[PDB]
Design an enzyme around this catalytic site. Structure first.
Site, PDB file in Angstrom:
ATOM      1  N   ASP A  89      51.547 -27.878 -59.742  1.00 13.31           N
ATOM      2  CA  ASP A  89      50.934 -26.816 -58.958  1.00 13.31           C
ATOM      3  C   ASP A  89      49.447 -26.649 -59.250  1.00 13.31           C
ATOM      4  OD1 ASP A  89      53.606 -26.070 -57.965  1.00 13.31           O
ATOM      5  OD2 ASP A  89      53.895 -25.250 -59.979  1.00 13.31           O
ATOM      6  N   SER A 149      44.064 -24.039 -59.400  1.00 13.05           N
ATOM      7  CA  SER A 149      45.387 -23.500 -59.692  1.00 13.05           C
ATOM      8  C   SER A 149      45.962 -22.928 -58.401  1.00 13.05           C
ATOM      9  CB  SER A 149      45.314 -22.436 -60.783  1.00 13.05           C
ATOM     10  OG  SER A 149      46.558 -21.778 -60.932  1.00 13.05           O
ATOM     11  N   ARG A 150      46.955 -23.618 -57.837  1.00 13.40           N
ATOM     12  CA  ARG A 150      47.551 -23.167 -56.584  1.00 13.40           C
ATOM     13  C   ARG A 150      48.305 -21.858 -56.769  1.00 13.40           C
ATOM     14  NH1 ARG A 150      49.730 -28.677 -53.905  1.00 13.40           N
ATOM     15  NH2 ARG A 150      48.174 -30.125 -54.756  1.00 13.40           N
ATOM     16  N   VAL A 151      49.147 -21.780 -57.802  1.00 12.40           N
ATOM     17  CA  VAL A 151      49.944 -20.581 -58.052  1.00 12.40           C
ATOM     18  C   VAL A 151      49.127 -19.455 -58.661  1.00 12.40           C
ATOM     19  CG1 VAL A 151      51.887 -19.730 -59.417  1.00 12.40           C
ATOM     20  CG2 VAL A 151      52.074 -21.901 -58.209  1.00 12.40           C
TER      21      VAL A 151
END
Ligand SMILES: Nc1ncnc2c1ncn2[C@@H]1O[C@H](COP(=O)(O)OP(=O)(O)OP(=O)(O)O)[C@@H](O)[C@H]1O
Ligand SMILES: Nc1ncnc2c1ncn2[C@@H]1O[C@H](COP(=O)(O)OP(=O)(O)OP(=O)(O)O)[C@@H](O)[C@H]1O
Ligand SMILES: Nc1ncnc2c1ncn2[C@@H]1O[C@H](COP(=O)(O)OP(=O)(O)OP(=O)(O)O)[C@@H](O)[C@H]1O
Ligand SMILES: [Mg+2]
Ligand SMILES: [Mg+2]
Ligand SMILES: [Mg+2]
Lengths: 56, 470, 478, 240, 354, 121
Positions: E316, E341-343
Site C-alpha cells: 500500500d 502512503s496510499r492508506v
C-alpha cells in the site's frame, strides 16, 4: 565594444563547458541502461540454449 | 568393504558404483591409486569429491586432477571424511595445494600430524562476539579514515603497480609483530609465474616465516580451484579456535572462485541463473564468507581482491560479494606517482566502522574534518590552476596550506619498504594518529616545511625532521 | 570377448558409438576396421563415445573397432625441423617420412611453481612498436587480439623471421586456416630462410574437428621436447577461437551439457591447461624456456565475448590491433592505449628501457589531444609542440612488411626522436629520414652499434649526439 | 463474471457495464499452471497457448444484436516493458487504449496518460466533428515536435532554437500541463474537490491555447485545473 | 509400516527423492533418520519429492524416512517472546527450550473481503520524516526500498524500539543476513529493552535455501497467533530479495523453466501469498491487526526491475531511500518525490494533519 | 555447381568462375535441417557443425597446378549484424570484397563499385 567582445568570449566558453557536462551525464545514464540490456540479453540467450537442450 | 568401481568417465566428471548400503557421504574424498599391470595401462593417482547420489548405488564425483588414463572397473577407496589438510605450526612457511600436499621442495608432512576437514558448518549464533571492536593495523590512513573491524571483510581495489603486494606484506608484518597473530594467503586461480614471484617476494622480505601459503593454479580442474579457499580458511580456523589469536586471511581473487563454481555447476548439468551463473551462487558465497567471523576466543579478518567483470558493479557476482564487505580500500596511481605511499585514496576508501559509536566522538570528528579539508582542496584545484594562487581568498590559502600538510602526513614509512629506501619504518598507534591530525588541524605546525611531513610516522618525528632540515 | 574389440552402433557427424571395449582408457587411441583412427572421449556405462580423426564416410554400423593401448601422443625430435606435419605427426609436404625416434603424450603436466624462474630475457620481435611499448620476454605468453585483416599473421611471420641470428626454435600452428594461406606462408618462410629452424603444424578448415582440437597440444608437445633439453622455443597459435568452436562442436555432438554460448563447462580449463605449459625453467631444470603467442579473432572489435575474456584473463598481456587504425594508414596498427605487458621492463635491454619512457608519455599525451587538432591553435606554447611530437612519434612507429629491425637501430632512432633531433624535420620526410639514417649508421656508426650490442647500454651521449648532427648535415629536406 | 454479464446481455437484452480489475493476472496464472501440465516453455517462459487462451476469453466480451456490453479492463505491464508478450498480444483485442507512463507520473502529471501512444477508433471526422479532429491532430503534432526537440534541449539548451521552435516549446509545455486534471477520487490524497469537464469545453480550451490566447500566463497555472477559466483564476490568485 | 516408512533414492543440493510413504499427504512434515526435518513437495506415482529443511550432508541413499502426520507447522505462544529462533521454531540463542503449547500451519488462507476493516489507527515510528510525510497505519503494508547501505535496517530498529509504551508486539525476520549483524541487532534491542515484546527469527546466508524461503512464512504464522486474539503485531521482513533468490535457486534445482531474470513464474504469487495475510480485522473478529514492512534492495537505484515492481504492486505504498542523499549526510535519506502512503492520511492524528 | 566447375578445372586445366548468389542460405538450410536430426542447438540456434560444413564447401575452391577456380559470392547479412555466426564464419574465407553503392549509380558512375569500402588482401 571591447568589453562586449570579452563578455561574448566568456559566455561562449561557459556555454560549451555546460554542454560538455550535460553530455557526460547523459553518457553516465546510458552506460547503466547498456549494462542492464547486456545482462538481459545474456540471460535470454542462455535460457533459450538450455531449453533447446532439454527439449531432446 | 567400502570399495567402489568406476563406471563412467566424461571429462572431469567420474561416476562410481558402490555396494548397497555403503555409499559415501556427500563431500567425502575418494582415492584412486592404480599401478599399471601391463604395457596397455597407465599409473593413476587421483582424488575425487562426492557431489550427488544418483541412485542405484551410483555416485557422481568431480576430479581434482586430470582424468586421462582411467578405465571402467578401477577400484575406488572411500576415506570416510572430506578433504583433510594438515594444521598447526607445521604449516607456517610452507606452500600447499588444495589437497594439502606441500608444493615446495622442503619435504612432506609426517603422516601422524593432525588434519582437519575443509567442509564445516559456520560457527553458531551463541558463539559469536557481541561487541564490535577495531583491528589496529598501525597504518595511519587505514586506522584513521577506513578502520578495519576484527572479523570483518575488506575489499581491496587498485590498478597494477600501485603497491598492493607491499601493503599486504606490511599488514602481515604489523599484525605478527604487535598482535602476535599470523596470516594465510589463498591463491585462487593464480598464474604460476606470478605465484613464484610472490613466493620469492615473501621470502626475501623475511615475512614468509609467519605465513602459510596455499596455491590453486589456473591449469587445475574447476573442482580444485573451487575448494582452495576452504583449505586456507580451515588453516586459519585452526589458529582462531585452538590458540585464540587474531588471524589474517588473504584471497587472491574471489571472482575466480565464483567462476570456478559456475563451471562446476555447468559440468554437473544444473540449469543456470541470472546472467549465466550457478543457481547456488549466493549459498556458496555465504557458506564461504560466514566462517570468517569473530568469536569469543579469537577472530579472522579477510582482505579480498575483487575483479568486476565488464566494469559492471550490478553484475551478480560483484553484488553478492559486496553484500558481505565491511570496508573498502582503494589505491590510486596518482598518489603513487606523487611519491606518497601507500597511496591509499583518502576519499574513495570507505568503512562501516567510521561511526562515533565505534571509534569515539573525537576520532569521528577528526576524520570528518580531514575529509572535508581534502574535499575543499580537491574543489580548489581548478581555481588554483586557472585563476591563480593569488586569486584565492585568505580562507582558501589557509585551507590549501593545511591540506597539503595533511595529505603529506598520510604517507608512512613501511617496515618492508626498507629494501627500497633503507628507512627502518615505524608502527603508529591509532591514538597517536588522531592526536597528530588534530594538532595539524589546529595550525600548531603551520610554520614547518611541507616536505618534512613525508614518510614520517608520528608527530614528533616531523619536528625532528624539520630540525634536521634546519 | 569384448575386452579389446568393439562394435559400432551409431555413426554421424564425425562421432561414433561403440559397444564393448571394456579395458579402453580415457583418451586412448583406437583404430577402425578400414584404417581410420579414433580417440575415445566418452566412457559410458554401456557404450563408448569415439571421435573420428579422419573421413568417416567409410564407417558403417556394425564395423569392428580395435584399441591400441596407447594414450594420444605425437613424434618429437630434431627431424621435424623444416617440415610441415598434421597434428598426428604425419608429414603433408610430400618430402618423405620423418625419422623421429621417440614420442611424448600430448597431455602432460605443466612445470611446477618451484621449477620456474622469473622472466628476464628479452625476445626481439623486430617491430619497433612491440619492442618499445609492449615488450615480450622469454617464457612469457602474450595475447594478440584483433579483427579480420588487421595484420596478426604478418606480426607472427615477422617475429619468426627475426629469430634467424638468435638461438631460437619456432613452431607455427595454424588452426582452421585456408590451405592456400598456409602454403604461401611456408613459401615466404622458405624464401627468407626461416625454415631452417621452424616447424609448421597445420589443421585446415576442411579437416575434422578433432584435428583442430588436438593441433595446439601437438604444438606444445613438440616444443616441450626442446624446452626440457635446455633450448628456447617460440610457439604461435594462429586461431584459438577456431579451437574453441571445434571443441564446442565435439562436446555438443557427444551430448554434454552446454553453457554460455553453447560452450562446454570446461572451455576455460582447456585454454588454461594449454597456456600454462609455457614457462621459464629454473637453472636446476636446465634453464630452457618456451614462449607462446596465442591469437584471438574478434567480431567488430567486440572483446566482451566469452572466449576473448577467458584468454585475456589467462595470458600475461594483450596486443590490440584496431581496424580503424589500419584503415587510417597506421600499420601495423598497434593500439598502445589498450595494449599492456605485465612483464614489461624486465624484458628489455638497458638502452631500450632508458629511451622508452619518454616515448610512452609522448604518445599518451598526443592520443588524448588528437581529437582537437583539426581546430588549429588552442595553446601555441605547449599544445602545438605536443601535437608535432606526437605526429612524428606516430610516423616513426610505422613499419613495412618482412623488414625486421635490429634492436640497436631501434634504440638509436627512438633516442633521436625523443631527444628532439626530429623536431625540425617535416612530418612527411620522417620515413625517408629513418631509412637514410640506418644506412648512415651502417657506413659510419659501427662503433655505436658494436657498443650497444656488447654492453646492452647507450653509448657516450656526446658521441651519438655528434653522429646525429653529422647525419643531419647531409640530409636534404624535400 | 463474464457468464453473469452474458446472461443480462442475452436473456434480457439490457446494457451492461463490465469492469475487470487486472486481466493480466489471468495470463500470469495460466503461465504458472502451464509448466506443471507438461508443456514446453515459450519465448519468455509463458505458455505456448497464451494467444489462444486470451482470444477465447476476449472474444466472448462483445456487443451483439440482442444487447450491448461495454468493458473497461486494466492491463498490467511487467517491468514497464510494453514489448512483453502478454501486453503485446492484448492490444489487438481493444477498440480504445490508454497508455500510462511512469515518467509523466514522476513529473507530477496525472492521470499520466501518454498523449501519443493512446489511440481510439472513434477519432474520425465523421464521428467527433471536424473541429474536434483538427484540434486533436494539431495538439498531437505540437507534442510530436516537442518530443523531437528533446535531445537538442537537453544538451544545448533553449538558446540555440529558432523562433518557431521556441514558440512550439512554449505552447507544448502549456498543452502538456493542461492535460492533467483533478479527480474526485484523488480528493482523499490532496484535499482538492475535483472537477468534471464536458467535451466541448475541453475542445474550446485547447483551441484557445493553440491560438496563443494564454501565452502570457505562467505554466504552473495549468496544473490540475479543470476548465480553462480556472487557469485564469489560478494565475490571478498567483499574482499575475 | 511401509505406508509410514520410506527409503531415500536420490540426494543432491538439498533435494531428496524417496520410495514408499503411501499415506503421506501433500505438504506434510517428514523426518529423516539423521533427525533433519523435511517437507513433502511432490507426490508422484512411485516416489515422493522431499525438500530438506537443514544440512543434507548427513543424508545418504538408503536412509529411512518416516511420517510425522502433521502439515507444516511452527510453535506459537507467549513463551516465544524475547527468544531467537530458526524458521522451524527451534531456539538458537542457547537459553534453553521454548515451552509452547500451540502450533499454527505455515500456509493459511488470508482474511476474506468481509473480514476486514479500513485502517484508522496510527503506527508511530518515532521518525519525523516518516510520521510527517509517509504515515503508516496499523494493518498497512508499507514497502521500504533502497540500495545497499542506505539505512533500511536502522529505520526498522528505531520503529521497533519506539513501540515500548504502545500495545504492540514486534517480530523481526532476518533473511540472508550476516550472523554478526543479527547478533549486534539483538544486543542493541536488549540494550534498549525491546526484547520484552520482540521475537527474532533468523535464517543466515550460510543456511540452505529452503530455510530462507520458509522464514517469512514462519514469522507471519507466529504473528497471526496474536493477531487473531485481538492484539496488534508488527512484522519486519529484512530482505525479500534474498527470499526471492533462494526460491529461484530452489525452483531451478527442480528444473522448472524460468522467466525473465531467471525467476520462476510463481515468483509474484510467492510474495502475494505472504503479504495478503497482513490486515486490519473487523470488530466481528476481535479487531486485531498485523502490520508488515517488507524490504527490497535495488541495484543502482533502478525501481523498474522485476522484483521491485512485483512488490510495489502488492503493498500500500513505498518509502524510497536514496543513496546520494545518504552519502551527503542527509539521514534518513527519504526521497519525498517517490515515497507515498496510499492508506496513510486517515491514520494520522488531527494535530499532525494540520 | 562446384562439382560441375571442378571437372573443367581438373580435366582441362582451365580457369573458371563460380558464382554463388547467396552463400548465407547454405548455412540457413543447414541450421533448419539440423534440429530435426536430433542435434543440440548452438550459440544462436545454428547447427554445431557450421564451421565444418562451411570449410568442406569452401576448401574445394582452390588454385592448383592444372588450373584454378575463383568464386564470386554474394553475401546477405541479416539485419546488418556482422557478429552473427554465419557471416562471421563466412568472412574468414574471403580474400577480397566488392561493395556496390546506389549513390554512385545515381551519379551515372558504373559499375558503381565503392572505391573506399572495397578492400583486397
Ligand atoms: N611503500 C612503498 N615504499 C616504497 N616503494 C613502494 C611502496 N609501495 C610500492 N612501492 C613500489 O612499487 C613497486 C612494487 O609494487 P607492487 O608489486 O607491490 O604492486 P602491485 O600492484 O601488487 O603489482 P603487480 O600487479 O605487478 O603485482 C616497486 O617499484 C616499489 O618500489
Ligand atoms: N605492416 C604492414 N604494412 C603494410 N601492410 C600490412 C602490414 N601488416 C599487414 N599488412 C597487410 O594487411 C593485410 C592483412 O594482413 P594479415 O594477413 O596479416 O591479416 P590477419 O589479421 O592475419 O587476417 P586474416 O588471417 O583474417 O586474413 C595484407 O594485405 C597484408 O599485406
Ligand atoms: N540516521 C542515521 N544517522 C547516522 N548513521 C546512520 C543513520 N542511519 C543509518 N546509519 C548508519 O548507516 C550505516 C548503514 O545503515 P544500515 O545498516 O541500517 O543500512 P542497510 O541498508 O540496512 O545496510 P546493509 O545493506 O549493509 O544491510 C550504518 O553504519 C548505520 O549506523
Ligand atoms: Mg604486486
Ligand atoms: Mg591470418
Ligand atoms: Mg540491512
Amino acid at each position: 565594444l571591447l568589453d562586449a567582445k570579452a563578455s561574448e568570449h566568456a559566455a561562449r566558453m561557459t556555454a560549451m563547458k555546460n554542454a560538455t557536462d550535460n553530455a557526460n551525464e547523459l553518457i553516465r545514464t546510458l552506460t547503466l541502461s547498456y549494462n542492464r540490456a547486456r545482462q538481459a540479453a545474456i540471460t535470454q540467450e542462455i535460457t533459450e540454449i538450455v531449453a533447446g537442450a532439454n527439449a531432446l | 568393504m567400502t570399495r567402489g568401481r568406476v563406471i563412467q568417465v566424461m571429462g572431469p566428471v567420474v561416476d562410481v558404483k558402490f555396494e548397497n548400503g555403503h555409499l559415501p557421504a556427500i563431500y567425502n574424498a575418494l582415492k584412486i591409486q592404480h599401478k599399471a599391470r601391463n604395457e596397455n595401462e597407465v599409473d593413476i593417482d587421483l582424488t575425487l569429491e562426492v557431489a550427488l547420489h544418483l541412485g542405484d548405488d551410483t555416485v557422481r564425483t568431480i576430479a581434482m586432477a586430470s582424468t586421462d588414463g582411467l578405465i571402467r572397473g578401477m577400484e575406488v577407496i572411500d576415506t570416510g571424511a572430506p578433504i583433510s589438510v594438515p594444521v598447526g605450526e607445521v604449516t607456517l612457511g610452507r606452500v600447499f595445494n588444495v589437497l594439502g600436499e606441500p608444493i615446495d621442495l622442503e619435504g612432506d608432512i609426517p603422516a601422524d600430524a593432525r588434519r582437519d576437514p575443509i567442509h564445516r558448518p559456520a560457527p553458531k549464533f551463541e558463539e559469536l562476539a557481541t561487541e564490535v571492536e577495531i583491528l589496529e593495523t598501525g597504518i595511519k590512513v587505514v586506522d584513521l579514515l577506513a578502520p578495519y573491524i576484527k572479523g570483518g571483510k575488506i575489499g581491496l581495489f587498485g590498478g597494477a603497480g600501485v603497491g598492493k603486494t607491499v601493503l599486504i606484506q606490511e599488514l602481515i608484518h604489523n599484525i605478527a609483530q604487535e598482535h602476535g597473530g599470523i596470516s594465510v594467503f589463498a591463491g585462487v586461480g593464480e598464474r604460476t609465474r606470478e605465484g613464484n614471484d610472490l613466493y620469492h617476494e615473501m621470502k626475501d622480505s623475511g615475512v614468509i616465516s609467519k605465513t602459510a601459503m596455499v596455491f590453486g593454479q589456473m591449469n587445475e580442474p574447476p573442482g580444485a580451484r573451487m575448494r582452495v579457499a576452504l583449505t586456507g580458511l580451515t588453516m586459519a580456523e585452526y589458529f582462531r579456535d585452538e590458540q585464540g589469536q587474531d588471524v589474517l586471511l588473504f584471497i587472491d581473487n574471489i571472482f575466480r572462485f565464483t567462476q570456478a563454481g559456475s563451471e562446476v555447476s555447468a559440468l554437473l548439468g544444473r540449469m543456470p541463473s541470472a546472467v549465466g551463473y550457478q543457481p547456488t551462487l549466493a549459498t556458496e558465497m555465504g557458506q564461504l564468507q560466514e566462517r570468517i567471523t569473530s568469536t569469543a576466543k579469537g577472530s579472522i579478518t579477510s582482505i579480498q581482491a575483487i575483479y568486476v567483470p565488464a566494469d559492471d558493479y550490478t553484475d551478480p557476482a560483484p553484488a553478492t560479494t559486496f553484500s558481505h564487505l565491511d570496508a573498502t580500500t582503494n589505491l590510486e596511481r596518482k598518489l603513487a606517482e606523487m611519491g606518497i605511499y601507500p597511496a591509499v585514496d583518502p576519499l574513495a576508501s570507505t568503512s562501516r566502522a567510521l561511526a562515533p559509536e565505534i571509534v569515539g566522538e573525537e576520532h569521528y570528528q577528526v576524520a570528518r574534518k580531514v575529509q572535508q579539508t581534502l574535499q575543499r582542496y580537491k574543489e580548489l584545484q581548478d581555481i588554483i590552476a586557472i585563476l591563480g594562487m593569488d586569486e584565492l581568498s585568505d580562507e582558501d590559502k589557509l585551507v590549501v596550506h593545511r591540506a597539503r600538510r595533511i595529505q603529506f602526513f598520510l604517507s608512512q614509512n613501511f617496515h618492508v619498504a626498507e629494501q627500497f629506501t633503507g628507512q627502518p619504518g615505524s608502527y603508529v598507534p591509532v591514538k597517536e594518529t588522531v592526536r597528530g591530525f588534530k594538532e595539524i588541524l589546529e595550525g600548531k605546525y603551520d610554520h614547518l616545511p611541507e616536505d618534512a611531513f613525508r614518510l614520517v610516522g608520528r608527530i614528533e618525528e616531523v619536528v625532528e625532521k624539520a630540525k634536521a632540515m634546519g | 570377448q569384448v575386452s579389446d574389440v568393439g562394435t559400432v552402433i551409431q555413426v554421424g557427424d564425425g562421432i561414433a558409438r561403440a559397444h564393448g571395449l571394456d579395458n579402453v582408457m580415457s583418451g586412448e587411441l583406437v583404430e577402425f576396421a578400414n584404417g581410420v583412427m579414433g580417440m575415445a572421449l566418452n566412457l559410458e556405462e554401456n557404450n563408448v563415445g569415439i571421435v573420428i580423426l579422419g573421413p568417416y564416410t567409410g564407417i558403417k554400423e556394425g564395423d569392428e573397432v580395435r584399441r591400441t593401448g596407447r594414450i594420444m601422443e605425437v613424434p618429437v625430435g630434431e627431424a621435424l625441423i623444416g617440415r610441415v606435419v598434421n597434428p598426428l605427426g604425419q608429414p603433408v609436404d610430400g618430402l618423405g617420412p620423418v625419422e623421429t625416434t621417440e614420442t611424448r603424450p600430448i597431455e602432460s603436466p605443466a612445470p611446477g611453481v618451484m621449477d620456474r624462474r622469473s622472466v628476464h630475457e628479452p625476445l626481439q620481435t623486430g617491430i619497433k612498436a612491440i619492442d618499445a611499448l609492449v615488450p615480450i620476454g622469454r617464457g612469457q605468453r602474450e595475447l594478440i587480439i584483433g579483427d579480420r585483416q588487421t595484420g596478426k599473421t604478418s606480426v607472427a611471420i615477422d617475429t619468426i623471421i627475426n629469430q634467424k641470428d638468435q638461438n631460437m626454435i619456432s613452431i607455427y600452428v595454424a588452426i582452421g586456416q585456408k590451405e592456400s594461406t598456409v602454403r604461401t606462408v611456408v613459401e615466404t618462410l622458405r624464401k627468407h630462410g626461416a625454415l631452417d629452424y621452424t616447424i609448421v603444424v597445420t589443421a585446415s578448415a576442411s579437416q575434422p574437428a578433432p584435428l583442430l582440437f588436438l593441433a595446439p597440444y601437438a604444438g606444445v608437445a613438440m616444443g616441450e621436447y626442446f624446452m626440457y633439453k635446455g633450448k628456447h622455443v617460440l610457439v604461435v597459435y594462429d586461431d584459438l577461437s577456431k579451437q574453441a568452436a571445434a571443441y564446442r562442436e565435439l562436446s555438443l555432438l557427444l551430448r554434454r551439457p552446454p553453457g554460455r554460448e553453447a560452450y562446454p563447462g570446461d572451455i576455460f580449463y582447456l585454454h588454461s591447461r594449454l597456456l600454462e605449459r609455457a614457462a621459464k625453467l629454473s637453472d636446476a631444470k636446465g634453464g630452457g624456456s618456451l614462449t607462446a603467442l596465442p591469437f584471438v579473432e574478434t567480431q567488430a572489435g567486440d572483446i566482451s565475448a566469452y572466449i576473448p575474456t577467458n584468454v585475456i584473463s589467462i595470458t600475461d598481456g594483450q596486443i590490440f590491433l584496431q581496424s580503424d587504425l589500419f584503415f587510417s594508414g597506421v600499420r601495423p596498427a598497434i593500439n598502445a592505449g589498450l595494449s599492456v605487458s605485465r612483464v614489461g621492463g624486465a624484458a628489455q635491454i638497458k638502452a631500450m628501457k632508458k629511451v622508452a619512457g619518454t616515448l610512452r608519455l609522448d604518445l599518451a599525451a598526443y592520443r588524448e589531444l588528437e581529437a582537437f587538432a583539426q581546430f588549429g591553435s588552442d595553446l601555441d606554447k605547449a599544445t602545438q609542440a605536443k601535437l608535432a611530437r606526437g605526429a612524428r612519434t606516430v610516423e616513426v612507429l610505422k613499419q613495412d612488411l618482412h623488414q625486421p629491425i635490429p634492436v640497436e637501430k631501434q634504440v638509436l632512432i627512438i633516442y633521436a626522436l625523443t631527444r628532439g633531433f626530429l623536431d625540425d624535420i617535416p612530418v612527411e620526410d620522417v620515413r625517408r629520414f629513418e631509412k637514410e639514417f640506418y644506412l648512415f649508421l651502417d657506413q659510419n656508426g659501427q662503433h655505436l652499434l658494436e657498443h650497444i650490442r656488447t654492453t646492452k647500454d647507450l653509448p657516450n651521449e656526446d658521441d651519438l649526439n655528434k653522429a646525429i648532427e653529422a647525419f643531419k648535415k647531409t640530409f636534404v629536406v624535400s | 463474471g463474464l457468464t453473469m454479464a452474458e446472461y443480462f446481455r442475452d436473456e434480457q437484452g439490457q446494457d451492461v457495464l463490465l469492469f475487470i480489475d487486472n486481466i493480466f493476472r489471468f495470463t500470469q496464472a495460466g503461465s504458472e499452471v502451464s509448466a506443471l501440465l507438461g508443456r514446453m516453455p515459450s519465448a519468455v517462459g509463458y505458455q505456448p497457448t497464451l494467444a489462444t487462451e486470451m482470444g477465447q476469453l476476449q472474444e466472448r466480451i462483445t456487443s451483439t444484436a440482442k444487447g450491448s456490453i461495454t468493458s473497461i479492463q486494466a492491463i498490467y505491464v511487467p517491468a514497464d516493458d510494453y514489448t512483453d508478450p502478454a501486453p503485446a498480444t492484448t492490444f489487438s483485442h481493444l477498440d480504445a487504449t490508454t497508455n500510462l507512463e511512469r515518467k509523466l507520473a514522476e513529473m507530477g502529471i496525472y492521470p499520466a496518460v501518454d498523449p501519443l501512444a493512446s489511440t481510439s477508433r472513434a477519432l474520425a471526422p465523421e464521428i467527433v466533428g471536424e473541429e474536434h479532429y483538427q484540434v486533436a491532430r494539431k495538439v498531437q503534432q505540437t507534442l510530436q515536435r516537442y518530443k523531437e526537440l528533446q535531445d537538442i534541449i537537453a544538451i544545448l539548451g533553449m538558446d540555440e532554437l529558432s523562433d518557431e521552435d521556441k514558440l512550439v516549446v512554449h505552447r507544448a509545455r502549456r498543452i502538456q500541463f493542461f492535460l492533467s486534471q483533478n479527480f474526485h477520487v484523488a480528493e482523499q490524497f490532496t484535499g482538492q474537490p475535483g472537477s468534471y469537464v464536458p467535451v466541448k469545453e475541453t475542445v474550446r480550451g485547447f483551441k484557445e491555447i493553440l491560438e496563443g490566447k494564454y501565452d502570457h500566463l505562467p505554466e504552473d497555472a495549468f496544473r490540475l485545473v479543470g476548465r480553462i477559466e480556472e487557469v485564469v483564476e489560478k494565475a490571478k490568485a498567483m499574482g499575475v
